[PDB]
């Protein structure tokens, strides 16, 4: 009954969310339910393509839902057909726990503030029982605790203290960790260390201007401004969610979990519109902490699956986050009651100056002969907040046909208390008195659904190698011979591969059915990514079992519908045992992945060893990966862009 | 002359003139030409004494290199400018020096008029009267064991243009003339066993008039993106001294390294703290990967063979630096000893750099929020090495990091490919009859550190899992991990490569000092992952002429004049002998812990060409960064005005 959208990948409108919740409420009449997730169920890949390109059936508009029911363990999930307002698919899942929404997180603080056992711990730690309004917490999922499994829905409250509401609480962690039952709203346990450490008596480590004035005397004067103006408008064109820019076309989607989803990406190669990717997104994360001491093993957040890069996203406009002529998109979710909620300006789109695209000058007339073309890049960005952390996400299209993911980490370190006589090392750093910032890794799983110049793709590893022939042979007289060794993956097992400095390893995604007429190589997009940490948690560890994708830089599996989330559909409190998510998709490693519909999951990120520079608030730390056309074109695709400056040899002779 | 303000300033045009008059008169009655006339930088100890200890103002000195007609090799030495005298000299009969703009310019005329060359063109299918259509790129010979350093030699890489406006690289010829640079005479031509004649295809061109023919039309002019600074800039220049966002340093420039950054300090709330004494690019090598003759001679060491100063583009004419720019000029000597000037060789500006930091509280729906935006300072040059473009950006940032960004553009070096000829596995057929050979581009970053003062060390930092196994009392859940730090004791310890298996980084630190919070020494941390292994084999010509290239990191003791890791005079050295990095390494046993050190970092890329790269290549990026870690006690940027800030208390009031 709701109006269907312009485009089948368009996110659910507020009206569609509302229709969905009404329908689901009616199906479960008399049962006390709440809504965890109401989100688009995207159309099967075959149907979307058949619709888009073959005059095919229009795909059903579907809402996927996850609910809880009071007094029932676990969740229910299902699908609503929006045209007919009915529930077409249903199941109860009594042994999983679902993503934690903003409403789940905001509850927990008032729960621990009112708990007599927590209050008593605060008293023993040096906070008087009448000042519980000053105790705050970051309510994480418990993550995984073998004492409860998925038997109850749990959060672990990492507790802190503020002397004033404007303080940054992270200089003042407390020593204990309350375990809260999310649905009953009660503290069921508190992890208490053997060595007590009372609340720090130092000043809070603050960072607003009033705080800096006191700490350092004065603020630096306001800098003279840099202004950016586009008086004739922008060169990109939006039609609903569909973007066109510098020959690129694609759909900008968004959802509670992944945040930005770019679909149906193609490039217009002088009138021939060539597919590149069907879908590209961040599909999961894991942030594993490296202190072995109890209970710090429970810090290994899989932020996308346990909280959501959509649900956590910041409204962008007030902050001055995106500078210049900006196009915004809003996100729409359900709340607990089933009412649409909106986050305004969730996504910001703009184009920027990107330096030189290409330059060449001739030494013969002293660089008089010269051609110089400037580069513009298209940025589609979101920023999300995961308690203490900020993740800035920028998807970047470039004028050479390349596509790049840029990330900047900022926000504040997770911190735990440190005794006056306590050494942080080797597992963490003393970033401020009485403050221990544990070592950790931030790891991301990029999901790529490729369609390189069409259907039937493959992937390889490409390793730079010296010729096998020795120096002074006929084949390699001066020892200088080298090549690129290309290892095509045949089955899933062959693809499980790590980045390797010793070969400067890249990965190709390519179309074996086609051939570049100049070079004779298949057309390809090449993954060029060097920020690929190995997983430092040991095999069989809780971190490695809960993120089976993260132990390889690259995982390539057959395409199947609904293979989005590589640690499973319902991540919180999964032990990491069982065949689900990546472990399921890998299977016995034998399925074909040569010239077929494939998915390519790429683990990248950083290993962070904190230092005082990071504190009390951390300077942006950049991460990046690129996908470059290699043998996709027969020549530089930017040559038809007007140069900033051009003089030929004959024009230069004339002057 | 008059002395300049600052002892690190490059030589003025007057001073170069003064330099070459003095050398003219000391070699009175001799035909000599000038190859280099340039600042000899004062000893690091002299300089620091003048700067900080009331010490006398160092003497203004000029380093020169000259050739004398009829004499092998070169002569080099030093001129004391204040007394117009030669104070040091010596003759190097068995080296060859850096190739100047003019030594390059005369080769084409030499080969166009040479009769064996003319004959090779005819057999290649170009008539003897179309020789104005034959071009070459005049490289050093690099090294050829048929002549050593016994003659000064170039190798002319030959191309063909149908029209002077063509880009010549779609049309290489098959043969390679060898030219005596000083006799202006071709002495040999390398001719392959299988001849391949000039391509019949159209040239692969890239000017808008060519593109109009090739694809119908140019894209419409895009809507402008304009950058103004109505109130001017935040940085302040005094002569060549830069002040910005608490950094202070001197911007120098010479013929070989191009940009040289000296005396780098950071003003930490009134405490002026040293970071580097000097940083610059000190050498390159660009080893091609085709084993076939004569292509083993493609391995240009661009900095020592041609000079990133000598090769640099005037900027501004092209729209190379967008915004409100401050420019510096370069000054050199030509062959006759007269000052030449390259206008606008260096550009200085500030640009937006995204967010510096941000944090919002989820508790009031992100209404509690602070956002501060980043500005970066860019000091750059662009140089042309025949077909290649190298864009160099030294970047300072407001978290106190220094980054080097490089962008590679220009044109693929190409060689001819036959109709039936397969280019793989040593190159790519990027256009019909065009073979673009595999190659690496390697750079030697030279750091003379002075981290929070004198007495420094360097280490490798390697992320590692705990050695204790999953299930033990020490690592119950198997997640513990730490950074293993390996302090380099002796030169040999430092010889290290980037390691993905540990995400290796390198520290340059002051072990005499201590961070009050963390208890670690103050450090700048080299974060760099574009660290290709040298693919050329041990004992190869490449590995011998670039001994620094075989390790990502090489740390050696400071001595004055330890600048150029492939030796002072690079063209035609075979790579045998104890000089440059090989001399500085020695037997490997010298101390590098807590002393004056030099840190030489090898980084860059391995290039397997693709058609996207032809006929003109899109910028390929290379970066490395040096980040303060345990240097400060907190984020140094917090005193910068936020672009937006709202407290929890303010958010309630609204
Ligand atoms: N990375 C853990 C997290 C996210 C959001 C809220 C609490 C904790
Ligand atoms: N890179 C080789 C080279 C440099 C400058 C001029 C000619 C050739
Ligand atoms: Cu971190
Ligand atoms: Cu290259």
Curated annotation (Swiss-Prot), chain A:
Modification 2',4',5'-topaquinone, positions: 389
Keywords: Copper, Disulfide bond, Glycoprotein, Manganese, Metal-binding, Oxidoreductase, Peroxisome, TPQ
Residues carrying sugar: 227
Enzyme Commission numbers on file: 1.4.3.21
Cellular component terms (Gene Ontology): peroxisome
Residues annotated as catalytic: 303, 389
List of residues binding Mn(2+): 449, 597-598
Biological-process GO terms, alphabetical: amine metabolic process
Outcome following mutation: residue 303 to N: Loss of activity
Subcellular localization(s) per the UniProt record: Peroxisome
GO molecular function, one term: quinone binding
Induction: By methylamine.
Statement: the UniProt record of this protein carries the keyword Oxidoreductase: yes
Designated name of the protein: Peroxisomal primary amine oxidase
Ligand binding (substrate): 301-312, 386-391
PTM comment text: Topaquinone (TPQ) is generated by copper-dependent autoxidation of a specific tyrosyl residue.
